[PDB]
Every structure is written in structure tokens, then in C-alpha cells.
Design a protein around this ligand. Sequence first.
Ligand SMILES: Cc1nnc(C(C)C)n1[C@@H]1C[C@H]2CC[C@@H](C1)N2CC[C@H](NC(=O)C1CCC(F)(F)CC1)c1ccsc1
Ligand SMILES: [Zn+2]
Length: 340
Amino acid sequence: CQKINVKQIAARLLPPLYSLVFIFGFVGNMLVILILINYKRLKSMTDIYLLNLAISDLFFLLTVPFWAHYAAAQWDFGNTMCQLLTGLYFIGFFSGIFFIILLTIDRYLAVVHAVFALKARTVTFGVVTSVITWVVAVFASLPNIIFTRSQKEGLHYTCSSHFPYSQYQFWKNFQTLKIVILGLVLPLLVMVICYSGILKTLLRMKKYTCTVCGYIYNPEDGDPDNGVNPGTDFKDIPDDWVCPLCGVGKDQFEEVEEEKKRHRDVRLIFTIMIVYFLFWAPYNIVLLLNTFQEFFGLNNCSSSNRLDQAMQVTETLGMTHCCINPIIYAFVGEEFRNYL
Ligand SMILES: Cc1nnc(C(C)C)n1[C@@H]1C[C@H]2CC[C@@H](C1)N2CC[C@H](NC(=O)C1CCC(F)(F)CC1)c1ccsc1
Ligand SMILES: [Zn+2]
């Protein structure tokens, strides 16, 4: 068996691709950072988390031109930069998802537990949680920065991670589960718990009109005369209940179209999380497949080279995501459109 040489392809394909993701990302993110302070004026907890999410992206973007040069030639920046850039990449990766989860839990706290929302959703506490988030991200990145060095291999310089020989398999497995759990498994649980909890709180809030007379059932008012307590969802009401005006069943009732512009905050943060999974989930799956190829997949010569190739391709897609977040704000968020 023998591995494949991708240097010839990558030295042609990666430098113009990376440079453009950089141009479009640096410009895109700086526009976001500026508009959040100079127009939006950081009024809520969302504004603090979205700001830090754009900083984590810029941190990721700062490393991009260095990767473009390394792909095209070699590592001409030394050891200091090698660790410092792999650092900003990891710190930028972890804090990025960490702030998306904090933007998810935030919407779960605003929709559900509305009484606790107004009580504990300050700008000062938002900054405090943000300081501790950037710290946790650093500690998560820390082992990966340490085992990264820039070494000369024959006539070429490299900037890669080299785990300790004696415990090579343990660090390979431990770092795989740390990236996969904190980047896919953990936020995926948060996306399931929160958004199903938000949707069930939203659903209760919907108003239903009688298609016969026009009676609008408000959940907040209910129907005490017939025995329907206030707050109760229309769907949750027994079928035997009739219209308090004409006397028709729940079947001859339709959903009132909603101006989901309150829920525009929920609709945007949902797109940030969903689109994060289109760029980062393919890499996270392949990472688990490549590390656990023996006893959990195909360990053969051909399949291993295919897995390593798929890992580079899917980490290239994941990297591209740092320039994608402004496009979501430009389309989903009506506020960003109003600035132009
Ligand atoms: C070079 C280059 N050219 N284009 C890229 C990407 C921009 C595509 N790069 C480099 C490849 C490397 C090294 C720094 C940064 C950027 N990448 C981190 C990978 C990391 N993954 C790992 O360290 C795992 C590897 C497999 C394992 F050992 F089994 C477990 C750990 C990571 C962390 C968060 S996302 C990816
Ligand atoms: Zn009626």
C-alpha cells in the first residue's frame, strides 16, 4: 500500500479559492461587525452573541491567507505563527459553535420561560457569558495548539499536528470525539431540545378563525363559559367543543396567518444553526469514519486513501462557512436590508 499525492492539485485549487473566501468573508464580516455597533447599537443579548460570532469568523478568516500560501508553496512563517494560527482556527471553530448554541438557548429563554427572559437577559451578563465562552473555547483548543509545530521534512517545511508516539492512538481518538461531540452531537441535541420547545410554545399562540361566521379563538382568552381555561392551545381543546357564536365544530376552523415578524429573530438564528450543519456536519461524519476505520468500517488500502481525501474536501467546505453568515443576515433579517 501507498498514499496519494494531492500537492499538485491543492497548490492550484486552494490558493485562489481560499483568497476569495477571505475577500468575501473579511468584507462580509466587517460589514456585520460595523453595522451591529454603528446602526443596531448592541441593544440585546443576541447582539452581544452575534458580535462574538462575527469575531470568531474573522479569527478563522485571519488564518485563511496563511493556508493559501502553505498549499501553494510551504510554511515560511516559522513555529510561533504555526501554533498561533492553528490556535485562532480552533478557537475560531469552538467559539463559533459555542455562540450559535448561546443564540439558540437565548431564543429558548425568550419564547419559553418568558417571565425569566425579561428578568435574566441583560447586556452586561451577555458580555460576562461571552468572556467565559471565549475562555472555554481556548481551553478546548489548547491541546491541539500544543501538539502543533512547524518542522522541516527534508527540503520542505510543514505546519501540522504531531501527537505523542507512545499514546498516538489515544490522542487521535480523544481529539476526534472532542471535535465531533462539541461540533455536531452537542449542538444537535441543543437544536432538538430548544427548537421543539419553541415550536410547541409558538403553536399554542396561534389564533384560529371560524370559516362560517368569523369567530376568532384567542388562546390567551380561551372560552371559560364552555370550560376552556385561558392559555390553552386550540389543538389541545376537545373535539366536542363548538363555536360560541354559531355552534360549529373545530373542523370548520382555519389558522390565522401570522405576521411572524416577532418570530423573525427565531427564524434567523434557526437558519444560522441549520446552514452550520450543511458545511460542518459532512466533515464531522468523515472525521469519525477516518479515525474509526478499523473495526467500525473499511480499513483496506483504497478505502483509507478515499477517507483521507474526503476529509480534506469536507474541511475545505466547513472553512467556507465563515463567509456564509453575512449572506443569511442580508436575506433572512429584514433589519440588514433596511440599512441599504
Ligand atoms: C493546511 C490546511 N489547508 N487547508 C486547511 C483547512 C482550512 C481545510 N488546512 C488546515 C488543516 C488542519 C490543521 C490546521 C487546520 C487548517 N486544520 C485543523 C483540523 C482539525 N482537526 C483535527 O485536528 C483532527 C484531525 C484528525 C484526528 F487527528 F484524528 C483528530 C483531530 C479541525 C478542528 C476543528 S475543524 C478541523
Ligand atoms: Zn361560528
